[PDB]
Amino acid sequence: KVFGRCELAAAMKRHGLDNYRGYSLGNWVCAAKFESNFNTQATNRNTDGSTDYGILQINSRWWCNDGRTPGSRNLCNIPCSALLSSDITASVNCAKKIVSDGNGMNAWVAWRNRCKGTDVQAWIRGCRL
């Protein structure tokens, strides 16, 4: 599913991401834009053989099991395929663990490079929430 901007913002708000660990809703929308272009089915393969999955591009090296990343962990305790659903619940719940692990949203390279320090509120401008 390819979310609209405000559609995703509303869905993320209902799942508790607005100001989660101090990150306002705009940050999460911005990160999703540049990680996946709002597409829940996005996948991308890293040089080390791990794969990133879903709207927030969660990495199989640490966070989910895809059965092909040897020596990896599964800290969100989910199959990576679960992160590709049209229902973003699994992605959001795993994202909450990631962002709480000490590095905040710096774990998302596109957030660090394209959102951090910008007017992220612009990303929820006009949306009904």
Swiss-Prot record:
Highest taxon listed in the record's lineage: Eukaryota
GO cellular component, one term: extracellular space
Cellular localisation: Secreted
Active site: 35, 52
UniProt-listed GO biological process terms: cell wall macromolecule catabolic process; defense response to bacterium; defense response to Gram-negative bacterium; defense response to Gram-positive bacterium; killing of cells of another organism
InterPro entries linked: Glyco_hydro_22, Glyco_hydro_22_CS, Glyco_hydro_22_lys, Lysozyme-like_dom_sf
The enzyme's E.C. designation: 3.2.1.17
Tissue: In the egg white and polymorphonuclear leukocytes.
Residues that bind substrate: 101
SMART domains, A to Z: LYZ1 (SM00263)
The C-type lysozyme domain, residue ranges: 1-129
Role: Lysozymes have primarily a bacteriolytic function; those in tissues and body fluids are associated with the monocyte-macrophage system and enhance the activity of immunoagents. Has bacteriolytic activity against M.luteus.
Family per record: Belongs to the glycosyl hydrolase 22 family.
Miscellaneous note of the record: Lysozyme C is capable of both hydrolysis and transglycosylation; it also shows a slight esterase activity. It acts rapidly on both peptide-substituted and unsubstituted peptidoglycan, and slowly on chitin oligosaccharides.
Subunit and partners: Monomer.
Record protein name field: Lysozyme C
Organism: Gallus gallus (Chicken)
